[PDB]
Amino acid sequence: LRKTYVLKLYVAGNTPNSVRALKTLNNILEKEFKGVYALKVIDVLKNPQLAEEDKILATPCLAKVLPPPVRRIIGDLSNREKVLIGLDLLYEEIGDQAEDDLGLE
Amino acid sequence: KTYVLKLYVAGNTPNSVRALKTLNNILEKEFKGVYALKVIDVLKNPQLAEEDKILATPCLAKVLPPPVRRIIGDLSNREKVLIGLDLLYEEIGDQA
Amino acid sequence: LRKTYVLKLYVAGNTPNSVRALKTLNNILEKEFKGVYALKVIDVLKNPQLAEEDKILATPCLAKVLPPPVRRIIGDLSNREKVLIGLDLLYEEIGDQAEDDLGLE
Amino acid sequence: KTYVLKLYVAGNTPNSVRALKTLNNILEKEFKGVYALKVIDVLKNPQLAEEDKILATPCLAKVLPPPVRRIIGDLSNREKVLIGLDLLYEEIGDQA
Ligand SMILES: [Hg+2]
Ligand SMILES: [Hg+2]
Structure with missing residues (x-):
């Protein structure tokens, strides 16, 4: 429980390499910015409809x-x-959120 | 000056396609020159462009x-x- | 009272032209996207400290x-x-927000 | 591998500058090679670059x-x- 900046990654599916990469990403954030950042991965395949509170921007910019x-x-x-x-x-x-090697739930 | 309506979908289904065509018809016969339907299949093409973005359905x-x-x-x-x-x-x- | 996308513009000061431009911006949004968008102008000169719930990104990207x-x-x-x-x-x-020709309060 | 601490200020004051120098000293004598202070005066230079951004003070x-x-x-x-x-x-x- 803390107030931080949540990097939301929206993905459609995953591959063994993508899961490995997300776990590495999550580890780098918690290790380098212990608290300034936090990862949350959203798999649109599991949830086609996007929670109203969500929005998706292009990667290049952000x-x-x-x-x-x-x-x-x-x-x-x-x-x-x-x-x-x-x-x-x-x-x-x-x-009131979860914690696991793949970011937040 | 047109309103381009972008619909981001997670693939298609038999009915999904029935609904889309009717929608497109509803914009071409009922709101002629006001809207331009554009569907983007994500489960086919994930990568979002740079000027692109996907907003919440309930709002728009x-x-x-x-x-x-x-x-x-x-x-x-x-x-x-x-x-x-x-x-x-x-x-x-490019309205095609 | 509605749920929409708030474009936050962070500025330091203003000039007669900038105020005119912001009013025009606000008008275009309410007229073109009646509800999809809404403008909120934040003048850092009036409030140096940024409300915790706020963050500022570079213009070019977004x-x-x-x-x-x-x-x-x-x-x-x-x-x-x-x-x-x-x-x-x-x-x-x-x-629970205000409305005036310069966006939201 | 350094942590660059960026401080966005709305101008300066006599004390503001006293606090900054002491801060910079506190990073050069106490956390040598761990932090690199960088101050950006907004009331002097508004325009944010592209890789730049300003986050909430209470969090960072x-x-x-x-x-x-x-x-x-x-x-x-x-x-x-x-x-x-x-x-x-x-x-x-460019650590200067
Ligand atoms: Hg809306
Ligand atoms: Hg934090």
């Missing part, structure tokens, strides 16, 4: 304000694995 | 005429392929 | 997803008048 | 060491020139 290692993983997710639709960065309270 | 669905919203509510609740929408207001840069 | 006439005014605000720091686009409930 | 102020946060709380509450902050973690691309 991804430029993220740490360098993050821009790298993201670049591989959309360009190489092609599972990435877009993302969002939202300040929000985290605590 | 409100400024739309009652019939078009009916189909939208259908694609979101009935079929369940609708991820979200986008609404643009400008001069057509 | 401004690309806005209507064309909006990208134009914004371009004149930052490039020509130079009052524009950055912006944000946030979905939020509007109704 | 928490991951910072107690003394640096003390000054930050000072520039935000005492002086009142602090608009917000930004925190970067990377290899120095």
Whole structure:
């Protein structure tokens, strides 16, 4: 429970490499910005309808304000694995939320 | 000056396609020259462009005429392929 | 009172032209996207400290997803008048909020 | 690998500058090679670059060491020139 910036990654499906990459992304954030950031992965295949509170922006723009290692993983997710639709960065309270190697639930 | 209605879907279904064609007809016969339907299949083409974005269906669905919203509510609740929408207001840069 | 996308413009000061431009921007939004959008102008000179719920992003990225006439005014605000720091686009409930020719309070 | 601490201020004041220099000293003598102070005056230079952004002071102020946060709380509450902050973690691309 804390108030931080949640990087929302919207993906359609996943591959073994994409899951590995997201876990690495999540690890880099918690290790480098212990609290300034947090990852939340949204798989549109599991939930076609987007929660009203959600919105999806193009990666190129926003991804430029993220740490360098993050821009790298993201670049591989959309360009190489092609599972990435877009993302969002939202300040929000985290605590009635879950924690697992793949970011927040 | 046209309103381009962008519909982001998670693939297609037999009915999903029935709803889309009727929607497109409803804009060509009822709101001629006011809307331009554009469907983007995400489960076919994930990668969002740079000027692109997908907003919440419940919000954009409100400024739309009652019939078009009916189909939208259908694609979101009935079929369940609708991820979200986008609404643009400008001069057509490739209306095909 | 409704739930829409609030384009937040963060500015430092204003000039007669910038105020005119913001009023025009506000008018275009309410007229073209009656409800899909809404403007909120934040003058950092009047409030140096940014409300915790606020964040400011670079214009070039985000401004690309806005209507064309909006990208134009914004371009004149930052490039020509130079009052524009950055912006944000946030979905939020509007109704315990005010209304005046300069967007929301 | 350095943490670049970006401080966006709305101009300066006599004390504001006293606090900044002490802060910069506190990072050069106490956390040598861990932080790199960078101040950006908005009331002097409004225009945000493209890779730039300004986040909420209360959030980023928490991951910072107690003394640096003390000054930050000072520039935000005492002086009142602090608009917000930004925190970067990377290899120095012009540390001057
Ligand atoms: Hg709306
Ligand atoms: Hg935080």
